[PDB]
Amino acid sequence: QVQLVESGGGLVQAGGSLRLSCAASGFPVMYYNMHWYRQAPGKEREWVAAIESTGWWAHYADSVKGRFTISRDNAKNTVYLQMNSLKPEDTAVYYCNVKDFGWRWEAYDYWGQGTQVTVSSLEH
Amino acid sequence: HPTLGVQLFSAGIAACLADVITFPLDTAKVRLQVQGECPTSSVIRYKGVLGTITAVVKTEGRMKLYSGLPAGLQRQISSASLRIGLYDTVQEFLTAGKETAPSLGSKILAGLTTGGVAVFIGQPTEVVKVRLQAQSHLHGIKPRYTGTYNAYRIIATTEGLTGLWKGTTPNLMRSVIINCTELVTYDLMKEAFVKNNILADDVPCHLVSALIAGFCATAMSSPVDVVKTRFINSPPGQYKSVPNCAMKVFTNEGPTAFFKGLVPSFLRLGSWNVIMFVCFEQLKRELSKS
């Protein structure tokens, strides 16, 4: 019963920080690479970050590298996305993803419900 | 009758010649086996035997094909010497001990013992050679070593003599599978050809039998070979154990990943075996008649 639940999204000013969390459940997260995607309306789902089963490697989309960091804790079944210097084009629904390959021809994507990240460009 | 000196010297040279000739196949196999472990932003994708070799030659040069070759030569020397000096005594203990013929059981046990001792002796060479074959400047993983002896000293100092035997049990199991599968398959195929009279018993028959058995052994050992390569290549801490590496491979890439590098592995086995057989026979005959 795979179930990914994202949290930590919200409304943040441009240049601000946000830590997204993903509570994974129903599978042994210690064996699976974890991915963060995002999708803004009018656009296709964009791959953001990927992390190894135990966090040995981390890879980022070129648009977020340096600003976003993906992190892991398998003792809590949690995957983290720290987002810094946020900018209005980062406004999207962010999705936790597991590609369970197993006894399959292609990997099967399990998604979360996504957490919304809105970046304001207001001047004070 | 070739003496022990000419047999040992011939075996060493024939093994080393076969190794230097077929080393690009081994490097291609390793590159194909470690390809999906860590995602790469480079557009350099390894696909096929000649595709992988050509990509390596274009993006890294010719000498990158023969990376870890001194380690491979050391392994060939130790393995060939152990074969010539130990496979004889165990085999003749099993055959002449009860005055029995070299049955498949005796052959299986003799190959098992010789291969186990050889794997244990030549594991440091395997570790160094695999890490040097897999290290690259183009896929975001920083190469740990500059050569065979740099790798030797770095591994020894930073992670102990025991760290030079990493991957012994996967290699030992892979040796067991290779030996047993090859011998059983060769017997089954040769009995099929000789009883069904599908082919006459001339060396063409034995060549077809040996090629079929080699492919069957390579396919049967491919999962262990992929897991062994990835585990040996991994730095300390990446994989909790060897079953951990295998399970991560399964859950993240599937049963097809366990046959990564299958074509280069089989081609290197076949070409290495034929080159070593031809060179060995010619060399020991010329040394004995010299």
CA distance B40 to A59: 9
CA distance B91 to B176: 17
Distances (CA, A) of B125 to B146, B222, B262: 15, 20, 22
Dmax (CA) of chain A? 55
CA distance B48 to B55: 10
In this structure, how many other beta carbons lie within 10 angstroms of the beta carbon of residue B180? 18
β-strand partners of A99: A109
Looking at the structure of chain B, the number of domains it has is: 1
B226: nearest Cα among B33, B28, B24, B31: B33
Residue among A27, A63, A72, A101 with most chain B CBs within 10 A, to mutate: A101
Chain B: nearest CA to A107, how far in angstroms? 8
- Are A90 and A78 contacting, i.e. CB atoms less than 8 angstroms apart? no
Chain A: nearest CA to B276, how far in angstroms? 39
The reply to whether residue A50 touches residue B248, judged by beta carbons under 8 angstroms, is no
Contacts of B250 in chain A (CB under 8 A): 101-102
Residue among A31, A36, A62, A99 with most chain B CBs within 10 A, to mutate: A31
Tell me which residue range forms the domain holding B218: 4-288
DSSP-derived secondary structure for chain A: --EEEEE---EEETT--EEEEEEEESS-GGGS-EEEEEE-TTS--EEEEEE-TTSS-EEE-TTTBTTEEEEEETTTTEEEEEE-S--GGG-EEEEEEEEE-SSSSSPEEEEB--EEEEEE----
Using CA coordinates, name the residue in chain B closest to A27: B251
CA distance A119 to A92: 9
Using CA coordinates, name the residue in chain B closest to A30: B248
Chain A: nearest CA to B238, how far in angstroms? 6
Residue with tokens 């004070």: A124
Show Cβ contacts of residue A102 under 8 Å, excluding neighbours closer than 6 positions: A108, B250, B251, B254
Technique used to solve these coordinates? cryo-EM
The reply to whether residue A101 touches residue B251, judged by beta carbons under 8 angstroms, is yes
- Are B217 and B178 contacting, i.e. CB atoms less than 8 angstroms apart? yes
Q: Is B271 on the interface with A (CB under 8 A)?
A: no
| Strand A92-100 with A115-120, pairing | antiparallel
Contacts of B248 in chain A (CB under 8 A): 31, 53
Is B248 annotated among the ligand-binding residues?
no
Residue with tokens 């065979």: B148
Contacts of A107 in chain B (CB under 8 A): 254
CA distance B40 to A117: 28
Is B260 annotated among the ligand-binding residues?
yes
Q: How far is CA B270 from the centre of its chain?
A: 11
The reply to whether residue B238 touches residue A103, judged by beta carbons under 8 angstroms, is no
The reply to whether residue A103 touches residue B254, judged by beta carbons under 8 angstroms, is yes
In this structure, how many other beta carbons lie within 10 angstroms of the beta carbon of residue B100? 11
The partner residue sitting opposite B253, judged by closest CB among A52, A54, A101, is A101
Say how many Å lie between the first and final Cα of chain B, rounded. Answer: 12
Q: Which domains does chain A show, CATH number per domain?
A: 3-120 (2.60.40.10)
The partner residue sitting opposite A57, judged by closest CB among B38, B237, B251, is B38
The reply to whether residue B252 touches residue A104, judged by beta carbons under 8 angstroms, is no
Which SS3 state, helix, strand or coil, does residue B148 take? helix
Contacts of B231 in chain A (CB under 8 A): none
The reply to whether residue A32 touches residue B38, judged by beta carbons under 8 angstroms, is no
CA distance B277 to B283: 10
**Single-letter code of the amino acid located at B2:** P
Residues 25 through 64 of chain B touching chain A, CB cutoff 8 Å: 38-39, 41
Q: Which two tokens stand for residue B187?
A: 């017997």
CA distance B247 to B227: 9
CA distance A25 to B207: 54
CA distance B144 to A65: 24
Q: Is B139 on the interface with A (CB under 8 A)?
A: no
The partner residue sitting opposite A32, judged by closest CB among B237, B238, B251, is B251
Query: Which strand ranges, in their side-by-side order, compose the sheet holding A68-73?
Result: A3-7, A18-25, A78-83, A68-73
Contacts of B39 in chain A (CB under 8 A): 50, 57, 59
